[PDB]
Design a protein around this ligand. Structure first.
Ligand SMILES: CC(C)=CCC/C(C)=C/CC/C(C)=C/[C@@H](O)P(=O)(O)O
Ligand SMILES: [Mg+2]
Ligand SMILES: [Mg+2]
Ligand SMILES: [Mg+2]
Length: 528
């Protein structure tokens, strides 16, 4: 299907006048908020709720240091706001920030048999925070083994009779927990559906959240326009008609990896790569021959525009565009002398191409590999090792030692890649199966373990579960690299959860899952 967006994003003229107005009041609101954080004499519950609100409002990136200092202090003090609500929240915020706070803070809320006291089933605010906390657990938090099921059943039971906006918050949470959602998406929901309708809302924070969100949206729109023109000038739409035209959906991903203004250059580099690798994918799937695909793979490994001759005219178009793109990246980074890092992204791309070729070889032979062998090849084809690597290109702070750590396939990255693989395999099984693609994950799983499609899917779900625990562990201090370089990997996993929510295929169908988000993040501004 052709792009549903049209030339809608092609042109965007920022009203510098309005943007300057927003920038100026935001700066003042920023300081008022800073002083709220630095206020002495606040109770623990009030301090935690303040930080939690600023994060959900999507403005916490302005106070990364003040929030860190406060959570550090709270971490170094340990306490018993003897209630579930404050305890679960404290646990969650500390864990999401890398502080390894003990899970035993939940002991006082469980019986002698390890299970949560059923007598808490009437504390909705406690159940909600426990619910959100249950999603940041690691392999060492067996104490929280039943937290999810427990809080879920009682939240479902209470939801219908709660007041608004709390009811909407509970219902949304049951459908999408905070820890695993895309930040801009959760922030947009919280601001206009929840906080804006909160009777006890803090008008200063709300004003701040709306203006900042809309101000950034202007930046996002500018970037997307810039990328749309770039995409239009390549004109693969008329040249390579077999390919998908989803530059908008590709941008959403880049936006999900990082939304901060300081990452503008990174987002633009990232979208172009996602967009570009998407064409290579379509070329291997619906268009090329074993001979064509073979020469394509080889040309890519050699990586020299002298190879453009050994390729069919249509593949010459893809190939040249790819080398030019990396040449542009090299050019873009000259200024800072960070052009030497481009090679890391290139090596990852070559890897994706190789496995794509193996993937098609498996399809042609009708091979159904054991899960073990399937993953050895299918993990890279998610393109995730490649996107994570690509996401660092525009991060002015990323060093050679940072890429070096990533090149070794750290557990956190591996976890994120596995999540994308198993979830995608579960959501796209039946469709790929109807295409004769018998080397699909669920199939390999079924044959390998000699189980049903249901049992296989359930197995992949456990792999995803295990993978999230690994990610949560990977965020704990001391981290192998700055948190700044872990967040992009976490966000990639989040994008997976959001794109295939309820096992709906949002990869093969944009209008089914992403359309709403794209409208709320890139079309409609939050009305003040
Ligand atoms: C806005 C965006 C980016 C939405 C979708 C993001 C998402 C998680 C893409 C999954 C990529 C997979 C794994 C494709 C193949 O490996 P295949 O076609 O073989 O399943
Ligand atoms: Mg493919
Ligand atoms: Mg698939
Ligand atoms: Mg496929």
């Amino acid at each position: 299907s052709p792009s549903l967006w049209g030339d809608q994003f092609l042109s965007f003229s920022i009203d510098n006048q309005v943007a300057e107005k927003y920038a100026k009041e935001i700066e003042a609101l920023k300081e008022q908020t800073r002083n709220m954080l630095l206020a002495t004499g606040m109770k623990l519950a009030d301090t935690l709720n303040l930080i939690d609100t600023i994060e959900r409002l999507g403005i916490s990136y302005h106070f990364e240091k003040e929030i860190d200092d406060i959570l550090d202090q709270i971490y170094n003090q340990n306490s018993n706001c003897n209630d579930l609500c404050t305890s679960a929240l404290q646990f969650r915020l500390l864990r999401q920030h890398g502080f390894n706070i003990s899970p035993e803070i939940f002991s006082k809320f469980q019986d002698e048999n390890g299970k949560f006291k059923e007598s808490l089933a009437s504390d909705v605010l406690g159940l909600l925070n426990l619910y959100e906390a249950s999603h940041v657990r690691t392999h060492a938090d067996d104490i929280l083994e039943d937290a999810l099921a427990f809080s879920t059943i009682h939240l479902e039971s209470a939801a219908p009779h709660l007041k608004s906006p709390l009811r909407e918050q509970v219902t949304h949470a049951l459908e999408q927990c905070l820890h695993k959602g895309v930040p801009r998406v959760e922030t947009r929901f919280f601001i206009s559906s929840i906080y804006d309708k909160e009777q006890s809302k803090n008008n200063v924070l709300l004003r701040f959240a709306k203006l900042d969100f809309n101000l950034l949206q202007m930046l996002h729109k500018q970037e997307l326009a810039q990328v749309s023109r770039w995409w239009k000038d390549l004109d693969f739409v008329t040249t390579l008609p077999y390919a998908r035209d989803r530059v908008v959906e590709c941008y959403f991903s880049a936006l999900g990896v990082y939304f901060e203004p300081q990452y503008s250059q990174a987002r633009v580099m990232l979208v172009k790569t996602i967009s570009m690798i998407s064409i290579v994918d379509d070329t291997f799937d619906a268009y090329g021959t074993v001979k064509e695909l073979e020469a394509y793979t080889d040309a890519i490994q050699r990586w020299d525009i002298n190879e453009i001759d050994r390729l069919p005219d249509y593949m010459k178009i893809s190939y040249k565009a790819i080398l030019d793109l990396y040449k542009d990246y090299e050019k873009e980074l000259s200024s800072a002398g960070r052009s030497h890092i481009v090679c890391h992204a290139i090596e990852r791309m070559k890897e994706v191409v190789r496995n794509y070729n193996v993937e098609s070889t498996w399809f042609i032979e009708g091979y159904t590999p054991p899960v073990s062998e399937y993953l050895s090849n299918a993990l890279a084809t998610t393109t995730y090792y490649y996107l994570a690597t690509t996401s660092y290109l525009g991060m002015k702070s990323a060093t050679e030692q940072d890429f070096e750590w990533l090149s070794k396939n750290p557990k956190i990255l591996e976890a994120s890649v596995i999540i994308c693989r198993v979830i995608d395999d579960t959501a796209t099984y039946e469709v790929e199966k109807s295409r004769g693609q018998i080397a699909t994950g669920i199939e390999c799983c079924m044959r390998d373990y000699g189980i049903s499609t249901k049992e296989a899917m359930a197995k992949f779900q456990n792999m995803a579960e295990t993978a999230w625990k690994d990610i949560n562990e990977g965020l704990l201090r001391p981290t192998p690299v700055s948190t700044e370089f872990l967040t992009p990997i976490l966000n990639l996993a989040r994008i997976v959860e959001v794109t295939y929510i309820h096992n709906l295929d949002g990869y093969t169908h944009p209008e089914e899952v992403l359309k709403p988000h794209i409208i709320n993040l890139l079309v409609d501004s939050i009305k003040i």
